[PDB]
Amino acid sequence: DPIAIVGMACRFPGGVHNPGELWEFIVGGGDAVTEMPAFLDGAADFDAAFFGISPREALAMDPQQRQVLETTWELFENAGIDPHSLRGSDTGVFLGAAYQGVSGRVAYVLGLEGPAVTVDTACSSSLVALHSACGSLRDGDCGLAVAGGVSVLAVDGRCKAFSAEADGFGFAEGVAVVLLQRLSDARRAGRQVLGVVAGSAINQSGVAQQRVIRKAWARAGITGADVAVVEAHGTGTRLGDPVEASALLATYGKSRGSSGPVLLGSVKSNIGHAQAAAGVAGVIKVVLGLNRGLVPPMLCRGERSPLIEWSSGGVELAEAVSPWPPAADGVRRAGVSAFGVSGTNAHVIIAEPPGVLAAANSVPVLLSARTETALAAQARLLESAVDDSVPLTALASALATGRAHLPRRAALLAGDHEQLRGQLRAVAEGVAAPGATTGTASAGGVVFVFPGQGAQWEGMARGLLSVPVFAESIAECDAVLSEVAGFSASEVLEQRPDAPSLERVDVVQPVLFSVMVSLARLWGACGVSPSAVIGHSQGEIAAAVVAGVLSLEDGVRVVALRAKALRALAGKGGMVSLAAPGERARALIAPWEDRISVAAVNSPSSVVVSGDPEALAELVARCEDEGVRAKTLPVDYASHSRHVEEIRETILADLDGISARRAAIPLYSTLHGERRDGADMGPRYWYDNLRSQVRFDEAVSAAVADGHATFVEMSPHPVLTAAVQEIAADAVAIGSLHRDTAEEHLIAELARAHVHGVAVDWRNVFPAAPPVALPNYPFEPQRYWL
Amino acid sequence: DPIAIVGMACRFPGGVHNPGELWEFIVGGGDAVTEMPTDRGWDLDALTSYSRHGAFLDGAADFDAAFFGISPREALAMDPQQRQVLETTWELFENAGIDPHSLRGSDTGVFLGAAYQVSGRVAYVLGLEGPAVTVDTACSSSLVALHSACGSLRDGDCGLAVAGGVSVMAGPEVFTEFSRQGGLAVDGRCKAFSAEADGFGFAEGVAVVLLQRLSDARRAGRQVLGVVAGSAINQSGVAQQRVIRKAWARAGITGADVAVVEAHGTGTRLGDPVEASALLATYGKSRGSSGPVLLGSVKSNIGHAQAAAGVAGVIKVVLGLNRGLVPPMLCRGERSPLIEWSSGGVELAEAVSPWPPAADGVRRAGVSAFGVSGTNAHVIIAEPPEGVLAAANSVPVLLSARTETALAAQARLLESAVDDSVPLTALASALATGRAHLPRRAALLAGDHEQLRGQLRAVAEGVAAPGATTGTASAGGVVFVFPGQGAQWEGMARGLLSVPVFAESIAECDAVLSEVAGFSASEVLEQRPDAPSLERVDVVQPVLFSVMVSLARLWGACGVSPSAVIGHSQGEIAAAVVAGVLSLEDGVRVVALRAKALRALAGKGGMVSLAAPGERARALIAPWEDRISVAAVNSPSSVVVSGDPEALAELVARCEDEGVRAKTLPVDYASHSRHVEEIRETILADLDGISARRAAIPLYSTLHGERRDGADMGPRYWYDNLRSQVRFDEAVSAAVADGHATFVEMSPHPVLTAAVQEIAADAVAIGSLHRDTAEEHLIAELARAHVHGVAVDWRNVFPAAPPVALPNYPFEPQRYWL
């Protein structure tokens, strides 16, 4: 069960911020040595806040810790792993370092509960850490290990590797880490396999170098013609480079035949002798090469060292890029060597590696930082890699499934690349733009709102009927709604030609239910289950089911039989919307105190009266005189009025046999402006809910009174999001569908709930994508140095 | 069916403002003749008249046009005659003890006499729908006006008549005209039957009497002051003898049946002997053992009241008849010797004497009045033939007025006006039933005479005093609030138990409450030793219900019936029956059985009052969203929450931290909370069978904060009232939304009167009883309801009283003169 590389990250002098930037800094770039403060730019720069570290503790912190800390985050961004997801995993940390003025705090700061080791590199070298990393894994001592090293004599400062003027090494600062994982686990988690650690060996002189080298091969199973390249320890010292050359010559440079001579390189020629980082660096250099199918070159100076016996077989330097030939078995391979001054030697063999965003047309691409400064910087860093090789699903799935979700968040909804450059450019300056919502994460539960009539439209949620979770419940309604009413909800919703009309109350209302409880199930799917439900008129029967109070068989019987018994009030009644408080409301209908009821108080600015048609006409006439906005509603029945008393006897007889039962979830009854247990919500409740007033902003006030501050509305159109904001200023209201934008509004609202801190299961929203290259977090750098 | 005089009023010079004041004036022998007034803008210099004298009304110019709804521009256009009759026709109704307001749209006639120096205007201003006649240019007499009045009433052409006459010499042209004709006295005195009789002197005056068929005046319990036994008119002494003999002829008497004669007595040289001669020929003859007839002309005292003289003289004889004393003349010199005094028995009435009855026992008299027209008239005036409140120990004496000014004036008046002599039930009953209740009102509660003077003197300066409500009347009906828990005290309403209306409902309650609960509400209320204890929930509530229905039937009897009801928790059961929804028997069954059921929550919960809005208390109890319910919203600053006790103590601790006055109610059960769901299936089983019915009165439900037709208030309602919130200040503000502004509360101690005012700052809340001042409080509040425009049936409050002398409304004078 091979060990798979699945991430890489690195930092080296001369401005090498990532594995990608090291390759373009090698092929044709890089001699990063010069004077004092090869040195890391901003090695004292650390983002203490980002990790939760005090300024007092961060200069009490070895810059080696700090720099590993950031670039281990980088590693995780690069493997597409949410660091937060790893808190409390069995995740090894294997690093190497030595005093100059450690895995324990990295594994702490990051909440990792795997083994943390810090191999002393004054003794060993970075390849020992990888050797141990790979041992944990195949032993089961963990399920994902970080492996690398960090570091905070030739007189020109340069390592002249395998060159006649090699006269001592130049010592460089640097970080270099990779992320590892048993292969069958890597693809089971759908990970980018960048390559395999085929074989590894360590021991403790030219004979020893040969033995560890044939030792490696023994564990990989390979021979030395099966490798094409060697990343050598090449430190540039007078007798050092002869020894290793001899021992590659004895080893790689024989038994090749049809396979041509091995190519020799030491990255230290380019970056310097990264002490505790140069080993894994050496690995990173190799890995970049295996995927490009190219031999990384070396920076050669002067001629070959004459102290070396190049004639003795096939091993010559790699000065310029070249194609990487596979081994006879078609696996491109390399070998990496590193030798501590202690006497520790190691050689390792790197072998090449073997919902329904449907329904809408935009895609939510998500960003998140810990400070608005960095969100704006993340926002610029993302014009960068938009357009060809990268679709938008692929890109967006990377940013939602791979990134940790931080405080200040941002969701750009796009359906083409060019539109999305503009949105990110906008957030680059805190400027608004279409599809571009910025926000700030706020934990806590979510309250699901179930409005009543007034939302509906012909063809609502027709797009969702192809979404397997939405259709599945629309099917379950169907079975009973045909049972009580001899029609299905899918008829009406597919708009079948012979389907009953949404103009009928006893049709539209059950159609609304099924849409409403299925949007609930749909949001469940996308990872969002409610912590409390607020119903509105008929809405409450949907609430009653989401909250467990009634079976869906019973909840159908109710909105059906009650809306069918409701037909008798059609053509005799009406309703009227008023923008005035409920106080001024009952002032204004006082002249027609009979005939006209107050049917619902929705918010300090919204009231619905219901009653007799002529009386409503004289009422609105008054309203316009007294200059208050009013609006006759498109109904011909006065719901929540003396009119309903007519059907009380029958309602109670049709609903007889229902089973109300204790609410699985807090339900705030709008009959009562108050949480009611649920076991009493039987026949008489559905009478008394229809006859009496909907105390909406009483329950929204009761819930808000209890800390709830996130509401999500299961409605084909947003009708009470305005109301909730008017009750609770500081609340946040989300709807689902929307006549005009049908399903596009929905994924947008999904994005927007996330942005405010709702926990969305993006892992099921998005299909499986190819990998894509996203920049790293822009750390805010405050310099700590003593 | 005889014609009864039921009221009198007059207004004569020399400060005679009422009847009794004239009778004081002549017995002291006043002579109301003065010099002639210059404030009327007369060319007195040129003036021409030889008599520089006369008898003029003090401030004839004055008038309270406000009080009658007449504009200051109309008032100056109003003949003073018409004003002075209006003010005095008001007084007449006051004296008669008749609410003028109640006579609008009545067939009440006006028969008046006057001449240029009017009955239909007085009729119009007062809303009188009877005959109106003005006996034209009173060249006959105010007695022709009376003669026609008595004729209508005989003819069934009306059922109350006003008769009399008014005189105000705006100009001196009747001093010029009779100065030519030579028939004026130079000193302005009418020296009647006197040797010095040298002509007459003219007089200003208003005089009126209120006439009613005796059968009716008695079936209206009026003060019969005297009777018009007969009258006659026609066209010389031989004339005067006919009109006299015919007056007796429809009176059914002879002249000895009469003891007194009020004569025309103008004091003219020619006139006196003619009438003396005719009276010698009539009442002088055929007396025997009856003694001579006694002769007066009131013009001796007040002058020739012209259009007003005819009934002036009738008032004088009515004064004497009821005092049983012959009024005196003012005599001057010795008898006219042009008068054959020798010819039989007529002597002058020189001073008071006992008034003798006729053979048949009836004092009588005769009044003459002869016009210059030649229209003569002679009338015969016969003397006339033949619960609650207990439970308190004060009595409400009311006052009312058109302006604040008047009400202070009315208070001064009334303080002297009637004390020590006469019971305050007699006085409070005459100020309550006998007057037009006006806008600016004031009730004064008192149980002794010297307190009533103190209160009375207090409102005379608009300062405060114990027992003394003032206010301002506000039209419209009344909502009956019915509170519940908290009210009760021990012995509550023991006083009213003997009040026969109140006692009858408690006996009604008793019947069924004993039938379903094994105890009488009376038991507990009589404080019997056997009685179950008011500490129990299943007793305190039925018993409170009974006190609540009864308080309401009592207010019914006192006149006051609810326009709309508002119960509170259990209070809604009382309102249910008061409003028609439930029979009294089902209402008891509901309050009995619910409170029995509520017993298994006793000792498991508690409730707690917070001085804070509902939205605050919702937030405050947030940490205990369970175990604690909001049980009541009573006002923008009063909530009651109920639930688990421990939960509440922690909440009480929370409120102490945030400076939010709270308080743990004397209750050990947590109603209108999750706690009740325990007994729901039992309530619904117990109450099954009761019978809701469309409310006969509008019921605002506290469950719903809104009016509910009431036919769906069967068992389920009585669970959901108990389990769910009490939305009081919702229901109140719904009724306030519907124009109500007066709430009176059928409770044993005022509890929600304070809420009600919080909800509506301008509303008015009345309570019934009060621990401390039990039945005393109810009368004080029944007055207080009246002060604010509530319509009380005072006639049934007060028992049957003797008449009383109440001062006249103090009209507030503007002068109007051209």
Provide the shortest C-alpha distance from residue B738 to chain A (in Å).
Answer: 5
Q: CA B103, B104, B110 angle in degrees (round to 5)?
A: 70
| Angle, in degrees to the nearest 10, between helices A505-525 and A552-566 | 150
Residue pair A514/A489 in contact (Cβ under 8 Å)? The answer is: yes
Residues of B in Cβ contact (< 8 Å) with A587: 737
Three-state secondary-structure class, residue A457: coil
Question: Which fold does the domain B479-796 belong to in CATH?
Answer: Malonyl-Coenzyme A Acyl Carrier Protein; domain 2 (3.40.366)
**DSSP-assigned letter for residue A591:** G
Burial of B591 (0-12, 13-18, 19+ CB in 10 A): buried
Among the partner residues A677, A684, A705, nearest to B618 by beta-carbon distance = A705
Size of interface A-B (CB pairs under 8 A): 45
B619 at A interface, C-beta within 8 A: yes
Asked if the Cβ–Cβ distance from A706 to B625 is below 8 Å, we say yes
Examine domains A3-351 and A447-756 and report if their fold is the same.
no
CA distance A67 to A459: 56
Q: Residue A234 CA to chain centroid, in angstroms?
A: 42
Asked if the Cβ–Cβ distance from A597 to B706 is below 8 Å, we say yes
CA distance B162 to B149: 7
Q: Which residue of A has its CA nearest to B725?
A: A672
CATH 1.10.357.10 correct for B395-477+797-797: no
A705 at B interface, C-beta within 8 A: yes
A417 at B interface, C-beta within 8 A: no
Q: Domain spans of chain B? A: 3-382, 395-477+797-797, 479-796
**What's the CATH number for B3-382?**
3.40.47.10
> What does B693-748 look like in DSSP terms, one character per residue?
---SS-BEETTTTEE--STT-SHHHHHHHHHS-B-HHHHHHHHHHTT--EEEE--S
Residue pair A728/A700 in contact (Cβ under 8 Å)? The answer is: yes
Residue pair B649/B574 in contact (Cβ under 8 Å)? The answer is: no
Amino acid identity at B419: D
Residue pair B444/B468 in contact (Cβ under 8 Å)? The answer is: yes
By what technique were these coordinates determined?
Answer: X-ray
* Torsional class of A556: left (φ above 0), alpha (ψ -120 to 50), beta (otherwise): alpha
A610 at B interface, C-beta within 8 A: no
Amino acid identity at B702: T
CA distance B545 to B530: 20
Q: Residue B112 CA to chain centroid, in angstroms?
A: 26
CA distance B140 to B152: 19
List Cα–Cα distances, A465 to A356, A462, A492, A493, B659, in angstroms.
11, 6, 12, 8, 57
CA distance A607 to A662: 31
Q: CA A191, A196, A202 angle in degrees (round to 5)?
A: 135
DSSP bridge pairs for A117: A94
Q: Which of A341, A395, A335, A323 is nearest to A365 (CA)?
A: A395
Helix (H) or strand (E) holding A323: strand A322-323
Q: Where are the alpha helices (DSSP H) in A526-601?
A: 539-546, 552-566, 582-588
Q: Which of residues 192-231 of B touch A (CB under 8 A)?
A: none
Three-state secondary-structure class, residue A749: helix
List Cα–Cα distances, B246 to A261, A293, B241, B252, B501, in angstroms.
170, 154, 9, 9, 55
Q: Which two tokens stand for residue B180?
A: 């030519």
B625 at A interface, C-beta within 8 A: yes
Query: Residues with Cβ < 8 Å from B208, sequence gap 6 or more?
Result: B8, B9, B10, B85, B88, B89, B92, B162, B163, B164, B311
CA distance B194 to B185: 12
Residue pair A227/A337 in contact (Cβ under 8 Å)? The answer is: no
Q: Which two tokens stand for residue A393?
A: 């699903």
- Which of A680, A681, A685, A694 is best to mutate for the B interface (most B CBs within 10 A)? A680
Provide the shortest C-alpha distance from residue A519 to chain B (in Å).
Answer: 29
Provide the shortest C-alpha distance from residue B648 to chain A (in Å).
Answer: 17
**Phi, psi (rounded to 5 degrees) for B660:** -130, 100
A593 at B interface, C-beta within 8 A: yes
Q: Residue B648 CA to chain centroid, in angstroms?
A: 54
CATH class of the A363-440 domain in this structure: alpha beta
Helix (H) or strand (E) holding A89: none
Q: Which residue of A has its CA nearest to B734?
A: A586
A706 at B interface, C-beta within 8 A: yes
List Cα–Cα distances, A331 to A198, A291, A326, A350, in angstroms.
11, 11, 5, 10
DSSP bridge pairs for A175: A11, A150
Burial of A643 (0-12, 13-18, 19+ CB in 10 A): buried
CA distance B618 to A602: 18
Burial of B646 (0-12, 13-18, 19+ CB in 10 A): exposed
Q: Which of B332, B101, B376 is nearest to B238 (CA)?
A: B376
Asked if the Cβ–Cβ distance from A705 to B630 is below 8 Å, we say no
Q: Which two tokens stand for residue A762?
A: 């993006």
DSSP bridge pairs for A346: A202, A338
Neighbours of A215 (CB within 10 A): 19
Q: CA B253, B242, B140 angle in degrees (round to 5)?
A: 110
A421 at B interface, C-beta within 8 A: no
Instruction: Output B681-689 pairs: Cβ under 8 A, ≥24 positions apart.
Output: B682/B597, B683/B593, B683/B594, B683/B597, B683/B715, B683/B718, B683/B719, B683/B722, B684/B715, B684/B716, B684/B719, B686/B593, B686/B594, B686/B596, B686/B597, B687/B589, B687/B590, B687/B593, B687/B594, B687/B714, B687/B715, B687/B718, B687/B719, B688/B715
Q: Which two tokens stand for residue A260?
A: 């041509």
Provide the shortest C-alpha distance from residue A390 to chain B (in Å).
Answer: 51
Asked if the Cβ–Cβ distance from B706 to A598 is below 8 Å, we say yes
CA distance A181 to B135: 129
Q: How far apart are the first and last CA of chain A?
A: 47
Instruction: Kindly provide the residue ranges of all beta strands, DSSP E only, lying in B594-684, ordered along the sequence.
Output: 606-610, 628-635, 638-643, 662-664
Three-state secondary-structure class, residue A339: strand
Three-state secondary-structure class, residue A545: helix
DSSP bridge pairs for A322: A295
A760 at B interface, C-beta within 8 A: no
With residues binned 3-state (H G I as helix, E B as strand, rest as coil), the percentages for chain A, rounded to 5, are: 40, 20, 45
Q: Which two tokens stand for residue A73?
A: 């985050």
CA distance A146 to A762: 26
List Cα–Cα distances, A324 to A2, A5, B365, in angstroms.
22, 19, 155
B347 at A interface, C-beta within 8 A: no
Q: Which two tokens stand for residue A166?
A: 């090699």
Query: Residues with Cβ < 8 Å from A740, sequence gap 6 or more?
Result: none
Q: Residue A675 CA to chain centroid, in angstroms?
A: 35
Question: Which fold does the domain A447-756 belong to in CATH?
Answer: Malonyl-Coenzyme A Acyl Carrier Protein; domain 2 (3.40.366)
Using CA atoms in the order A48, A54, A60, A63, what is the torsion angle rounded to 10 degrees? 0
Place of tokens 């405060």: B464
Its CATH architecture, for the domain A3-351, is: 3-Layer(aba) Sandwich (3.40)
Helix (H) or strand (E) holding B236: none
CA distance A490 to A499: 9
Burial of B319 (0-12, 13-18, 19+ CB in 10 A): buried
Instruction: Kindly provide the residue ranges of all beta strands, DSSP E only, lying in A664-753, ordered along the sequence.
Output: 667-669, 674-675, 694-695, 710-713, 732-735
Residue pair B164/B113 in contact (Cβ under 8 Å)? The answer is: yes
**DSSP-assigned letter for residue A311:** G
List Cα–Cα distances, B560 to A345, A667, B594, B753, B789, in angstroms.
112, 46, 30, 18, 11
- Which of A668, A692, A727 is best to mutate for the B interface (most B CBs within 10 A)? A692
Q: Which two tokens stand for residue B771?
A: 């621990």
Three-state secondary-structure class, residue B426: helix
